[PDB]
Amino acid sequence: ADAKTVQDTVTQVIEQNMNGIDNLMYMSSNSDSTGTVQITLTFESGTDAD
Amino acid sequence: MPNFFIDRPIFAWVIAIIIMLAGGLAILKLPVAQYPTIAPPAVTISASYPGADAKTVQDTVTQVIEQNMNGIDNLMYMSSNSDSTGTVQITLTFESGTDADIAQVQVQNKLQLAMPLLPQEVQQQGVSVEKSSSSFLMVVGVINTDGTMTQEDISDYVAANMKDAISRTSGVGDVQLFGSQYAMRIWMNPNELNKFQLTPV
Amino acid sequence: IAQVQVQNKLQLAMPLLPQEVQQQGVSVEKSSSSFLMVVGVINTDGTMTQEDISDYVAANMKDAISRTSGVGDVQLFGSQYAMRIWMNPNELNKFQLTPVDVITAIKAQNAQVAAGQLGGTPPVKGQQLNASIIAQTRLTSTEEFGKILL
Amino acid sequence: MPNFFIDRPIFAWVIAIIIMLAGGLAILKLPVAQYPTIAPPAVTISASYPG
Amino acid sequence: TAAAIRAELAKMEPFFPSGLKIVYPYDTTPFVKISIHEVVKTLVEAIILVFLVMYLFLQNFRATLIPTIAVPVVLLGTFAVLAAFGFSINTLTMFGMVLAIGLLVDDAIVVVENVERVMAEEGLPPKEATRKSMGQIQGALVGIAMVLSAVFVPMAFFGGSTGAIYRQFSITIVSAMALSVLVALILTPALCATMLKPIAKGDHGEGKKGFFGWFNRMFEKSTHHYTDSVGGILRSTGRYLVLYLIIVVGMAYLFVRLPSSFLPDEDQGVFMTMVQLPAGATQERTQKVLNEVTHYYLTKEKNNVESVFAVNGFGFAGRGQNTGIAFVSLKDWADRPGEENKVEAITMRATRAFSQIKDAMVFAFNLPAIVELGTATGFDFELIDQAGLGHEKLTQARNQLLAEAAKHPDMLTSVRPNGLEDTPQFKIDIDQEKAQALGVSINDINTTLGAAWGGSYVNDFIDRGRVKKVYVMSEAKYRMLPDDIGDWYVRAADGQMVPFSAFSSSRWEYGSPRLERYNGLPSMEILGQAAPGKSTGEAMELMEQLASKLPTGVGYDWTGMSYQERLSGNQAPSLYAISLIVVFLCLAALYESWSIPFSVMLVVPLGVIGALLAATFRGLTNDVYFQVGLLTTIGLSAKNAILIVEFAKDLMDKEGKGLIEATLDAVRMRLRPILMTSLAFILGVMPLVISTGAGSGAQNAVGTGVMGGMVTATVLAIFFVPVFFVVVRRRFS
Amino acid sequence: TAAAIRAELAKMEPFFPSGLKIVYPYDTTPFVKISIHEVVKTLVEAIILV
């Protein structure tokens, strides 16, 4: 699946549902032409990783 | 002790200043609110079926969720309200003092057991689980002074470019938008459909 | 915390399980292998059969007992009632039908359909009545299932 | 210390009654079971396929 | 969270299109920053008020400088330990600070006056004067830390929602008390011997040469007038012991007649309106009612209202075409003067006008003190469908209870169902045979009915780099009336279009718009209130008895505000009783006997009398602030009482004086601090009593009870305490 | 947990049909209340013996 085909489908559907989360600092999503996507949620330093 | 404090009165000042600086740093670091979280933690489950009557949803969604809502810790009671509009709301109120985060997990995990028994219609819309209070902290209204934007346009701007970041902000358990985000509406005409021999299908 | 990681990873395997397994449902529990107690239920009047006691305990007892805190898992010594459609192959071959046609007929007749709302939002300004619509509703008796047209 | 406790024997009774009331409230609040959870925590996954 | 939201919107502000402006119609943040500011103002005012009372007795500026440096060190110290125990700067924690100021100034006023007392009686240098001054109160102060903690600490063991409210106060006061006693041995003695100027023996400020000399002469004359009066009352011990029985009986009568209501309703500047229309009412009809409501606030309440945020199709129970809400915001507290411009009166005036509304129920109400706790305002009852009788049978069973409860308005008031009444609904019967005969599938029919009348989510689409839904639905005009069903056609196998009229039969039936299910089983919510003069437990017991007369298979359960009970009358006195037993122990350890302890145990009703007298006449109820205020007056009255009997006991054992000679000589030395204590405390809690605006509701409830209570705790106790010691040293000797 | 289960079943008892009766064929609760009672008896006996 091409870049625009995945970033429009998967990323946007995940990012929009990524609401109602504790101690979150920022959300950085990288999505490329190979098909794979990677949303990273970096939380405040010291929070319960589990 | 005071017999040692008369010879050394500076030691009394030092420990007092130490206690004063400890309180000075405390006021600057301690969070300010009107009242503390005294309420028992309540996690809520919320699903929706488009254009489905009361009996059609309460029989389908509620009963399929309630039956799978077993094997949960420190639960006090389960109160489910379901109406004709399609929406359902199962509330699991836990014992006052329990880990809000841990208690919210058990709910979602058990909800995933009921997830394939919910109809495609409910799954498509999406069921949400939130550890939220029933009271609003504040309401942030948005108005158009120039009159360039309609009620539905303001509703969409606030939804498509405001609600996203506001909901992500820590502490915010749930955001209720007073309107709706834009959607591609295809308003069918039955006379025109019958004419060209077509159906909504 | 340990029980979470299991269920979260199980959701990664969930779409690779066949529909048959998903429909039945996979459960994750942090439970011990030993029974604390067993609460047997008997009929002194003999008015209820083994399957009837099994259903009463399941439909009106197991629900609340499983919800009670500390209880990790409840094992019912019987089964809750279910609509059993015991097919006869000779009668099926006679009327030229297959189990496929039987499952297709039940799926079509025993159903709950989202009808909508009469005079709903967005309404044409001047509407006085706003009532819900009811289409097909699920069947409740053996007699209702008996009248399923194949 | 006992040289101060002979003049004040009530202080010894008070602290003992404080320790006795602390144990009295403890038995009434502490949960009763036969053995403690000594077992390693085991989580189980369970699925089923009809026939 | 809220300041971050304001920061989030500030970063969005430059990208907004032409016209788009932000408005705040509902906010709790301004009330927070004004309630805390009002408490910090009262705390600062108390420092100035304690200084002025100190200057009247201690003429020197340096003599008044010591307790003004000692007071902040306790207050700041309490915030440091508040952070250590995981608490926060809330109204509950800050109201504890305005209570503890009186308890901390007492430990600071007793130490400063005694050094001043010994320098004027024997003429010793500050080094030895303070050492001998601390020699008598060192055992008393450690004892104060042991007695006072024992009063407040048991108020933390309370469970549930209402239980955690008392847990906030229980630790905040004890922590402030522990720090005050600690600094009264570490900082107060060292300053007493370095800052205070040495005084010559025999001097009482007789030098005059101003207004201070007139007060010093009046004080010394009144001390001699008091010691002569206390000697006369001590001779006739009988009558005053009988007077105490009238006091303890009068205390018990006022305590039981006083009503109980927890946490008072405050003017938060924001309130809400409930809009509920009948069954089958439309959005257009609801807007007609909402416009009428919006009209009232904007025309008949111009001077009070600031902004109205009316929402159609959103309610408290949930969604619906017949439900509406209105978040009403008001102008600044200063801009709204008088009781008539307060939320309590505005809501009453609104409901009186909203009562005269045709075919609609509308009522406005203030916020229930804190967020959505509201464990007060009555009770809630549930009706479980235990046998599986059905919804139709459970409605009938509910109707029987509501009729049998309304006939007894002497115990139950406003017994109503929380749920929504059964609305008629249009049932459509798709004949399975008729559909198969024509050549149309049930899957095609169901899709045609669902997508047209109810709407259907097809798939997604992108609009300006944002995924949004695609919905298929019929145009409004073609789906408003029952006859619009025939206008819809389904394509058959042979290509022929068959209308719904050909294969369907439709009729009107009755059904519930909202079905409730409590704990898996079907339920029905019943909201009611206990009749005036009757308790909640008495109203619940009647409802439990009415549910027994209800048809078979229908059960009952209490939820939320009914699951959790009010602490007062249940375990609250019982928790003051373990506090009573622990208190007896900590004082017995200091008095080294079983007899003497009872002398300070009998000073307890002397403090309660003033607290009840103030609450009854003002009209205030037995609330959390009153109960914690009661706890403060008990510990403070005992603090004055212990110091009198300690001074009388110490001279008796350490000195060669008897019983009468030891009491009269100690009571004249102790008349100065007690008078200084009350005059600093009553004037210190005086702003809270006269307070108006935001926080005033709690300010008055904390103030009056602790002010009134202190009046009798120093007027009655000054004459009763020596009588309590003379009666206990006669019975056991 | 077990005493709450006994309380749960007690609230279900009045809605049971004709014939339906509860029986306890396996229980560890009686042994707990008799083992603790036997140890508390031995502890009391030790006070008398000392």
Author numbering:
A (entry chain A): 52 to 101
B (entry chain A): 1 to 201
C (entry chain A): 102 to 251
D (entry chain A): 1 to 51
E (entry chain A): 302 to 1034
F (entry chain A): 302 to 351
Task: Copy text from the publication.
The long-wavelength beamline I23 at Diamond Light Source overcomes these limitations and extends the accessible wavelength range to λ = 5.9 Å. In this study, we report the determination of diverse protein structures by experimental phasing techniques carried out at long wavelengths on beamline I23 at Diamond Light Source using S, Ca, K, Cl, V, I, Cd, and P as anomalous scatterers. Native-SAD uses light atoms naturally occurring in proteins or bound to proteins. We demonstrate that long-wavelength native-SAD has become a very compelling technique, where a low multiplicity dataset from a single crystal can be sufficient for successful structure determination, making it a general vehicle of choice for experimental phasing.
In contrast, AcrB, McjD, and A2AR diffracted to only modest resolution: 3.4, 2.8, and 2.9 Å respectively (with corresponding molecular weights of 115, 65, and 50 kDa). AcrB was possibly one of the most challenging projects due to its large sulfur substructure (45 sulfur atoms) and low resolution (3.4 Å) resulting in a ratio of unique reflections over a number of anomalous scatterers of 650. For McjD, two crystals were needed totaling six datasets of 360° and an overall multiplicity of 54. These examples show that S-SAD is not necessarily limited to well-diffracting crystals and the method is applicable even to more difficult membrane proteins.
